[PDB]
Amino acid sequence: ETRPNHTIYINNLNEKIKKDELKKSLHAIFSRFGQILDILVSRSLKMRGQAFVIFKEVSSATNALRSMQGFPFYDKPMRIQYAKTDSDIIAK
RNA sequence: GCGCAACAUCCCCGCCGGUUGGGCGCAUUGCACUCCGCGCAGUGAACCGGCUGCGCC
Ligand SMILES: NC(=O)c1ccc[n+]([C@@H]2O[C@H](COP(=O)([O-])OP(=O)(O)OC[C@H]3O[C@@H](n4cnc5c(N)ncnc54)[C@H](O)[C@@H]3O)[C@@H](O)[C@H]2O)c1
Ligand SMILES: Nc1nc2c(ncn2[C@@H]2O[C@H](COP(=O)(O)OP(=O)(O)OP(=O)(O)O)[C@@H](O)[C@H]2O)c(=O)[nH]1
Ligand SMILES: [Mg+2]
Ligand SMILES: [Mg+2]
Ligand SMILES: [Mg+2]
Ligand SMILES: [Mg+2]
Ligand SMILES: [Mg+2]
Ligand SMILES: [Mg+2]
Ligand SMILES: [Mg+2]
Ligand SMILES: [Mg+2]
């Protein structure tokens, strides 16, 4: 789960929030500490309430669990965690 | 073929299916990298398959 290091995985999000509003209301919050490459969100039955954001490299992504970890985001605390594997765009 | 919905407890809304998006509810704490859980309804939204009826060649 936690404690490898590739990118962030945010959990326990408000699923009522639509995809577009969520994808941008995180980029505006998660670039205070790094540059964002791509943010990914799905409202499917599994990946709803979860997000996948990747930055420049690894400690361009350690700079996230860094900050938030229970941020009252849309009336529910965040829970961030390092992505177990790596996103298929950084494998190049 | 073209244009329409009279019939409607103000107006608007012919019928049956369906799609996309919006709403509410149930369920979901879930590690992905093209979409996709389900239910409810005057969804005063846009459309797709048909059909009934009215008017005009
Ligand atoms: N004050 C306002 O701002 C306001 C608001 C709404 C309407 N209006 C006016 O009030 C008027 C009321 O008109 P309406 O809505 O009663 O008529 P309509 O114009 O809606 O209906 C005419 C059509 O009904 C169809 N039709 C008639 N009998 C039929 C039957 N037996 N079977 C199937 N189809 C049939 C025909 O195709 C006909 O062309 C309108 O002309 C409108 O201009 C005014
Ligand atoms: N101009 C015109 N063409 C028609 C009319 N009715 C049928 N047609 C022609 O017929 C074709 C088939 O349409 P349909 O609705 O299946 O014809 P239909 O079933 O005989 O029509 P009904 O008489 O109502 O039963 C259309 O493409 C038209 O060209 C009409 O009233 N006016
Ligand atoms: Mg009409
Ligand atoms: Mg009318
Ligand atoms: Mg009427
Ligand atoms: Mg009615
Ligand atoms: Mg219908
Ligand atoms: Mg729906
Ligand atoms: Mg819904
Ligand atoms: Mg149609």
Count how many domains chain A has: 1
Residues in contact with A42: Cβ distance below 8 Å, sequence separation at least 6, in sequence order: A19, A48, A50
Determined by X-ray
**Does residue A5 lie within 7 Å of nucleic acid chain B, judged by its CB?**
no
DSSP codes, A20-50:
HHHHHHHHTTSSTTS---EEEE--STTTTT-
Task: Tell if A77 CB is < 7 Å from nucleic strand B.
Answer: no
How many other C-beta atoms are found inside a 10 Å radius of the C-beta of residue A26? Answer: 21
Resolution in A: 2.8
Considering just the CA atoms, what is the radius of gyration of chain A in Å? 12
Strand order in the sheet with A51-54: A38-41, A51-54, A8-11, A79-82
CB-contacted nucleotides of strand B (7 Å): 22, 24, 27-37
Which of A40-54 are b and which e, b meaning 16 or more Cβ less than 10 Å from the residue's Cβ? ebeeeeeeebbbbbb
Q: Residue A59: which domain range? A: 1-92
